[PDB]
Write a protein that binds this ligand. Structure first.
Ligand SMILES: CCCCCCCCCCCC(=O)CC(=O)O
Ligand SMILES: CCCCCCCCCCCC(=O)CC(=O)O
Lengths: 290, 288
């Protein structure tokens, strides 16, 4: 139950909110913590300049000092007694190194930091962030560099819509892995959100209350196995890429759980891009990464 | 020579800065314009139950609705006589649909819109923007939704540092395709930037920088540019290029990338910039 965390280190700043969040989690749930950082310098392939002696001496010469850096930035935690393993890998293509360390390693979680400049604008993602969000097999927890709202709320977005049988397991996993988590922190404020589209321009009006006929019910099929009753479940219409973020904001939600199976969701990509809170994509298992 | 433009329509707002820029270009360079927009609706995803017929009907009604919508936003350009071609394709994964239309129609340039709130802040890119920036065989012009700097300035970033001759071919492609274009549009000023990063480092630094001044002076005088507009700095390009670009009054920056997708080396350069972007594939570059 989330007890082997992989923390992605940002080499461009000193504060690592991913690490801090990992520690906060460790204080409530426990597990391992691995400060990971793929590093690289352009100096290593200019072969016309440095023979292998100089270039590899410098290759290890970066790794050592940046490992020292991560130590100097995890020092208070280490001295306080937090079991943090530090590992700096020499790698081009960062996201690749991260995913490989996830698979070889044995990880429950990946915690990376995302930026937010202004209070009510969306969080800023990098290509690396996106690669992880669609290729990383482990549940990815994107942690924004902004403090958690004092009213803690977890939000679960469900693909209620499609009657397909692989979206059902993912739903129940999303909820279950959220309930086993919220209980263990806590707060334990778990909301359930569905989003369905009403088709606007044979009578169209039947399709509408049919779409909603399934949605209200399917949403509630989750709930009575999972005991989340009506008060914090939401079924609204409009576009998911707008329905769930503003909802998350009016709700004062600090995190949202997302599910993707397989670009991987332009339906969900647009959802992510206009988000202003923490993100937890749980790719369901039973999936293999390229 | 960019005379068959593909304009990506943002379906979440009404103003299309990509279209506006495309027209602006059309007035000085000429060519065609194709207003493109990939769309998809969840109803088509509902296998049950809409009988295949009405599902195609609602498909047709969404396509029709967006054709009317895009028509209604370019009419001031259309009635005035701008050859704007509208084509709405039905696709769930937009970047795929865009690249397919690029290769199928053979387009010279793709103009898409990126947001920027604030000055001295970075530009915001979408997943679609990133797929296009690394898989689109044609030059991609990301146009921010902010007015062009009143002092027009163009900047070209080259991988001078690493010696291999296809990065050289790509370099001069960048250069030629930037000046021959600025020349025909607004006579803007095209700058060129390099970035550079027994035991003894002190020799290594001045060996690399000795190299950069080499290659920069090798490039510049084939293109008849002045040393007054060549710049070579040390530090990381992902930090070097934006500070210069803002200090230089740059409105756009031309980038050179080869697939084997785009390295993190330049990806970081892209995420941190605050002006228009023009990514150029070496050609031919083959999209999967
Ligand atoms: C589905 C997620 C349910 C658990 C949410 C985790 C709560 C995190 C609280 C963060 C508190 C902080 O602001 C960190 C700190 O003070 O160092
Ligand atoms: C490499 C590209 C260099 C060519 C310069 C392009 C100039 C475009 C300036 C846009 C002028 C406007 O401000 C008109 C508008 O509102 O779109």
């Amino acid at each position: 139950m989330y007890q082997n965390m992989l923390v992605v280190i940002d080499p461009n700043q000193d504060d690592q909110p991913a690490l801090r969040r990992a520690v906060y989690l460790h204080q409530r749930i426990g597990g391992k913590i691995k400060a990971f950082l793929p590093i690289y310098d352009f100096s290593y392939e200019m072969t016309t300049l440095l023979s292998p002696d100089e270039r590899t001496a410098m290759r290890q010469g970066v790794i050592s000092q940046r490992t020292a850096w991560i130590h100097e930035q995890a020092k208070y935690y280490l001295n306080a007694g937090v079991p943090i393993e530090i590992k700096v890998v020499w790698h081009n293509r960062p996201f690749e190194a991260i995913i490989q360390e996830v698979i070889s390693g044995g990880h429950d979680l990946v915690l990376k930091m995302a930026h937010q400049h202004d209070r009510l604008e969306a969080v800023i993602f990098t290509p690396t962030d996106w690669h992880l969000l669609r290729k990383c097999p482990s549940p990815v927890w994107m942690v924004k560099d902004q403090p958690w709202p004092e009213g803690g709320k977890a939000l679960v977005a469900v693909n209620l819509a499609s009657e397909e049988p692989y979206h059902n397991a993912l739903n129940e996993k999303l909820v279950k892995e959220t309930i086993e988590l919220a209980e263990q922190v806590n707060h334990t404020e778990v909301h359930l959100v569905g989003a369905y589209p009403v088709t606007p321009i044979f009578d169209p009006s039947v399709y509408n209350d049919a779409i909603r006929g399934q949605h209200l019910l399917a949403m509630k099929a989750l709930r009575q196995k999972f005991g989340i009753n009506e008060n914090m479940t939401h079924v609204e219409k409009g576009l998911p890429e707008e329905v769930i973020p503003d909802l998350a904001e009016h709700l004062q939600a600090g995190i949202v759980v997302l599910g993707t199976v397989g670009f991987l969701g332009n339906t969900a990509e647009q959802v992510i891009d206009h988000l202003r809170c923490d993100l937890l994509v749980i790719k369901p298992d039973q999936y293999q990464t390229p």
